[PDB]
Amino acid sequence: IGTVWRDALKILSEESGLTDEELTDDTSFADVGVDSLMSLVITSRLRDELDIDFPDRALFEECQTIFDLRKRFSG
Amino acid sequence: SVSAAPVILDAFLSTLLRPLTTTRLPITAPYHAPHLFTAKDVQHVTDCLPPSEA
Amino acid sequence: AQMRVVAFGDQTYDCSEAVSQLLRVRDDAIVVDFLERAPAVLKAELARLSSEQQEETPRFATLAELVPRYRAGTLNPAVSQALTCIAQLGLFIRQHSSGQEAYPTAHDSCITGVCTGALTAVAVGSASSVTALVPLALHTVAVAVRLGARAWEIGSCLADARRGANGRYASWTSAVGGISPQDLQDRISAYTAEQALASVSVPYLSAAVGPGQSSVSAAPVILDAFLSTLLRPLTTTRLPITAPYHAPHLFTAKDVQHVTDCLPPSEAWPTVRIPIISFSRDEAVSRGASFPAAMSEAVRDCLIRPIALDRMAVSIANHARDLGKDSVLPSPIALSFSDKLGPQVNSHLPGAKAPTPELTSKSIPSAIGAEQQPMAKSPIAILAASGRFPQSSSMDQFWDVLINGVDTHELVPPTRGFGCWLHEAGEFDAAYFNMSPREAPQVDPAQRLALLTATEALEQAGVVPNRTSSTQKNRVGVWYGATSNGGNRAFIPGRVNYFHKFSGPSYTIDTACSSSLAALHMACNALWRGEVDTAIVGGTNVLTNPDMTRSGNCKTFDDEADGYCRGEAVVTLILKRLPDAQADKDPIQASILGIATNHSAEAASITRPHAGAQQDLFQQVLTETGLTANDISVCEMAGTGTQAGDSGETTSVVETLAPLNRSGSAVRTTPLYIGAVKSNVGHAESAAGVSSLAKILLMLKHSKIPPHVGIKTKLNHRLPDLAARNTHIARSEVPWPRPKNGKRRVLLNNFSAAGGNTCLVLEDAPEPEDSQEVDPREHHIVALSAKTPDSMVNNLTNMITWIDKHSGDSLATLPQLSYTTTARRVHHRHRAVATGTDLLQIRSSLQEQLDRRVSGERSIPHPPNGPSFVLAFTGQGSAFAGMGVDLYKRFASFRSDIARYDQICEGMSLPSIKAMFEDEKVFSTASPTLQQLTHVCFQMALYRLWKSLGVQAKAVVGHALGEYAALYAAGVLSQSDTLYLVGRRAQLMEKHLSQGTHAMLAVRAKEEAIVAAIDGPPGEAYEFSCRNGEQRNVLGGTVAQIQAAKAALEAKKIRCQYLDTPMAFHTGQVDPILPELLQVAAACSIQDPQIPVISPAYGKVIRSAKDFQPEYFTHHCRSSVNMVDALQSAVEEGLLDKNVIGLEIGPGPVVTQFVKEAVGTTMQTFASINKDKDTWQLMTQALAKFYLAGASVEWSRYHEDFPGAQKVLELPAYGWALKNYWL
Amino acid sequence: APLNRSGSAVRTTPLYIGAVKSNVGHAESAAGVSSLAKILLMLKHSKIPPHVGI
Description:
Chain A is mainly alpha-helical and 75 residues long. Chain A has five helices and no strands. Chain B contains two helices and no strands. Chain B is elongated. Chain A: This is Non-reducing polyketide synthase CTB1.
């Protein structure tokens, strides 16, 4: 999970323009400005690089902060 | 949203720089093309409804 | 300025017809759902009744079993009230769901009821839509059943039944006419005072129908005693009300609580919103009260108050004038005597009742496909039936033996008392079925005969696996009956499924005696479920061991004999849902409207049915189908050979289909006839039912009735003469015409002694649609096939005999023959073909072919995968006036393609090309750009059409303009890209050039002679524009150079011909357009070829996208067209060969000639178009050669545009090579 | 038993397998009903039996 989660963090930092250290548990997608189209692109990048079975809407539907996404990636 | 044939569409997208993020949508045909369809097309598609007055 | 009033009726209004009609309804989801759910709640609430009440309630599964009791009157109040309420609610729901009537609204409507409907008024008065009313409807049904139970019980407590009860329930109410209400009440008061009766037994007024008529209720005997006092002119009648209601001296609030207890408390009960107009109460307008409150008040009205009917009209008028309207439209539902209601209310309002008796209700046309009624209970169609029979070999011989009226009993052939046994017992065509020639005896005769009959039935039905969405390889189940005797008989349907490739359910059912009939029943059940789309059914009864042992089988119309006269039959049928068969254009022979059965548990001595069960079954089946006995023409008997049955069942069957009038007369108007297939063929133990079905189908086809071989002596003492009861038997043929615009229905039933009494009703095929559209085709193709040389010979001779017998049928039969014999058969290896314009041409051709085959010539199968075709695209040098406009007219795909291409050219700002294919006149004034665009468009369209027919290219080749069309066929370019390239190149070369500056010359001579015979080396004086062949070459250049070359060559005695092409490709003319052509070329989307391209520009076979760079188009347009070297390279590469079939796509065989010359004089070539030959002779010739070669042409698409020729004829059965096997 | 794309155990709860064939053999016509009877007994006693066939 650790390597896959770290690659996911790199993808999120790339898309949002933030830095890995900044994407902490408390931060919320609303503050990061992860827009709905942004959620789609992030999900596509995740399922393309790390080859995960993540539906395009779980990020928006379930993940309101980084912690929820971390839990989802924990599998 | 921008649409075209897949090959030319990919060719056009490649010349979009980094701060111009892009994705792909599950559309499998061209729509909203004033230069592709004409009134004949809309007449054909809707021609299945029999004519009547009620 | 109009209001509609909804009124419901009391128990007086009979509800037997309405309930049955609602049960019939199948096209409304809400109605069927409600009618299915209502029995559940009926049984649920009926299970909470006291022990005595439950003991006197009939057992049922659904409502269909209640209506007979209701009609008979032996139905207790508890369920009578609930049935009445169910009828009212169902009628309203149907009116407001399928009738597309807006739900009543408080703005312009109001509701009313009397004695049952006050319950329904609140239910309808609460919901705002039909869907929101079903749960409330069921709640009201529960309330009604509970109320009826309570009233029945109080009545039973007051007084009991009588010794002559006989099930029927006495009446408790009687209407009295001719006395005022108050006067009658005073009369009752005087009567009670005169007598001394308990306060709970005196008669009382239930309703005051008006100043001239009134109703009074009491106990039965007390009621009759009081009625005896009422003299004339007072008239009295006995209503069908079974319990005391409206009695303010028998019920109190406690009973109201008891009845209402079925509604649990809650806050979700919808408040009543549509005003309810009631009259018995003090305040006549009700609105706002919750559903439980209004329901309780309605129960109080129904149980404690006397309904004052006389004031109904005044109440409605008062409400109308309160709203301010000046008319009311009555909409009575199940309201007895509702006609008088209309004017009675209107008379109390201003006399301005505008008639306006119009209601536009033309239903909107239903969406295609969905118009058919949901698959539930749809008519079944019998497509075809085949099967062997004793002393016969097929259906036709069976009919022949039937009509002569001859008993099939005969001495057993030595090869295997007398019996009805198949003359030929076991013979098999082992070769056809892919089996060892010596292992056939291992498979028993039953399986072999089943396989033969199934194959014949499928062939006759015009069914080919995987052609239509209803004849799939995985939607064809097989149900088979089993007699009393995997690679055994248990897998007979397994063998059918395996050989005919069907992958579907298979079963071998057998219950006790109706194994085949039960199998058919379950096949129709599965079809109605949607499990399968087709079904092969029909059992077998062929014996294996003779075991012949008294000297008698069955006496003529008697039971003095001891034997049963058992027989053999291998019948098999096909089955489809009627809508599908209709949409597929198959030979529908009959239909199965409905089927039902029971087991007849009751037995007499050992195994017997009962007359009551038979009557119930006949009534049930006649009801579900919805047809009365007066329209059933003939009925058939299965029989069992017993004593009481075979004779008395006749009286049993007529009991329902022709009951005797009580006064003594003929109930029936049209004569009825009976028969028993087991009179000549004999009893087919496991297949008698299917044999009788076959007999019925034969009767329907030939439209006759067979003379009976039975009754010939004095009528049986157990079978009274039926002549009086509009029934009899025929000693000879009695014509049975199809009634004009009518249908002839038949009822087949089986009376197996085991107990089964399965019965079903048939129905003649729907009016055969009369195709009118003529077949524009002039030349037609007839195909044959077989799997063995002898089978092919037999097929050819059978077809020759068939044609000779219909040479004078009609001009519009040959297309039908072509369609049935090409697009509705499976094509074996051994093929044969004839083509012609008329029947005699085909007959003579087939006769000659058969003569050649029988002379001694062997028969050779075809290659395994069929031939491989190398396409060929012509250049713009042979176009003529009408370029296949007939194709544009007779083919939908071609027309759509041309329209599409015209639209796309208009999109790119290119000339339209539709005119070229419509008027046929603008060819004379067509610009070069339009010419080339039309050429390329036609090339693409024709290639697509040909590919649709089932020809797959193995290689491609073009000549200087078919190259663009050639590439698309190879998949290198998309159609839009090819059109854009061609159009833009034409525009560029038209813009930058001058017309007529250059020209082109064609010479038939070797290159060496050409170079040696003209002064000046090639390249400066003249150029080889295209190298066509060994001795064929063409040259181009300027006018001066060309004329000098012409003079030099003609002076040498070498003929040379000018070419009309105003432009000259592959010359110095095309030099100044290459930059712009390349610029346009780069914009297309090149792609890897899907098949080799025999490119003449590079003179090499090309199989990669690397060669089609944008410079390739420039090189092709500039450089010469080397054809001989490319063709030689293809020949040496193994691509082309003396075995592939060339096929030109374009105007005339020019390229195919080059290919044939460069590959061998024995190669076959075909041209799809020609200047002076209608396209269809070439089309049929090419398709015939493709077929005979071994190809697999898509015939179905060849006929799809010609509705005239879409009808399956009845060709003779497959010519099996009959070989004998018996062990 | 889905296999994770990255490769791991996705099916959390164990998915036992069993077959009556070894215990009593094969009836060829009653195999289905015999297996169903075994399922009913396992449900009643809430005990997956040991497997035989090693």
